[PDB]
Amino acid sequence: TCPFYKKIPGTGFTVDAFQYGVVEGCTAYFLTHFHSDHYAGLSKHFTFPVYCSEITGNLLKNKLHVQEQYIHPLPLDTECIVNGVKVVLLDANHCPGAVMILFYLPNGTVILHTGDFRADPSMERSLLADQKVHMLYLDTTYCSPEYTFPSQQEVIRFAINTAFEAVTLNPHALVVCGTYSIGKEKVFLAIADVLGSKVGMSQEKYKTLQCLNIPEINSLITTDMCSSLVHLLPMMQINFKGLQSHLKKCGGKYNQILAFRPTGWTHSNKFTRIADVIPQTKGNISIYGIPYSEHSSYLEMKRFVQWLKPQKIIPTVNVGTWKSRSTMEKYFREWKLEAGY
Ligand code: NI
Prior knowledge:
By secondary structure, the protein is of the alpha/beta class. It has two domains: 1-147 and 296-341, Ribonuclease Z/Hydroxyacylglutathione hydrolase-like (Metallo-beta-lactamase, Chain A), CATH 3.60.15; 148-295, Rossmann fold (3-Layer(aba) Sandwich), CATH 3.40.50.12650. The protein has eight helices and 18 strands. The strands form three sheets. It has a seven-stranded mixed beta sheet, sandwiched between helices. The chain has a six-stranded mixed beta sheet with strand order 6-7-8-9-10-18. The radius of gyration is 22 Å and the shape is globular. The protein starts with 6 loop residues before the first strand and ends with a helix. Belongs to the DNA repair metallo-beta-lactamase (DRMBL) family.
C-alpha cells in the first residue's frame, strides 16, 4: 500500500508510486526521474497515464517499453492543466530529465514536490519567486551538517587534471569510469573531451545515453571499444579484479589503468580536501573515489528552504527511523527560528 508522503491531497495524483499496484483514487501517476527506486513497478503492461519530462518519457518508451499512449511528456517552465489542476515542472539539478513539480490546488494551497534535487541559488529565479508555497515535499538525503562535499565544477576540475596528467606521462594508459544509473555523465564526458577521445561502452549503455537529449552526442560516444581510450563499465567491475580482467581484453593496447568511481558522500569528506584525494593502487591499476553529488549538501538545502519559507515540510528520504525523523524536525525548527518565518 501507498504511503502518505507519496499522495497529493486534494487531487487524484501520486508521485513516484508505481510499486503498490493500482492505487485507489489515482487518476494520474507522476514520475520525477528515471532512477530505479522511483520508477519501481513500471513495465510494458502499465495502462494508467504517466506524467513526466520529455527525457524521462524517452527512457520509459525505449528502456522499459511502456506504450506510447500512456506516456504524457510536459515541457518545463510552462503552466499545464492536468485533470483540471494547474501544474508546472521545474529542473531539479539532479540527473537528466529530473524534475520538481509545483501543484496549484483547487482550494488555493500551493505544493512543491522536489523529487530528488541538488538545490542551487539559480532556483530562487525560477517560477518559484512569484508566489507562496504552503507544503514542501523535500529530498532530505543529506539533511545533517556532517554532510559536506565540493561543487560539481571542482570535482570535474580534479578529474580532468588527474586524467590529462596521467595519459600525458603515459600515452599507453586507459581511463575507465564506473556507472550504474543515469546521472553524473559530466565525469566521463569531460575526461574524454580533454583527451580527444570518444567514450566507449556497451550496447545497453549506449541505448540509455541516446535517450537523453545531449547536444552533439553522436560526436561523443561509441560502441567501438577499440577506437576509444575512455571506457565505461558497470560500477561493480570497478575493483582490482574487474579491472585486471578488463585490461586482458584490450589485446596489449594498454599497460596501465586509471579508474574513477563516482560516489555520493563518504566519511573521508570529513577530513580530506578534494585537492588532497589519493587513489588505491595495485601494480599498474589505480582507482580514485570522487564525491560527485547529485543531491543537496546540508548548507545548500538549508539555504533553499530558508529562502522558500514553506509553512510545512514533509521529508521524503530517511523517513524509516524515529531517530532520523526527530533529527530532521529539529533542524527544520532551527532554520525557521533563525530566519523568522
Ligand atoms: Ni535519484
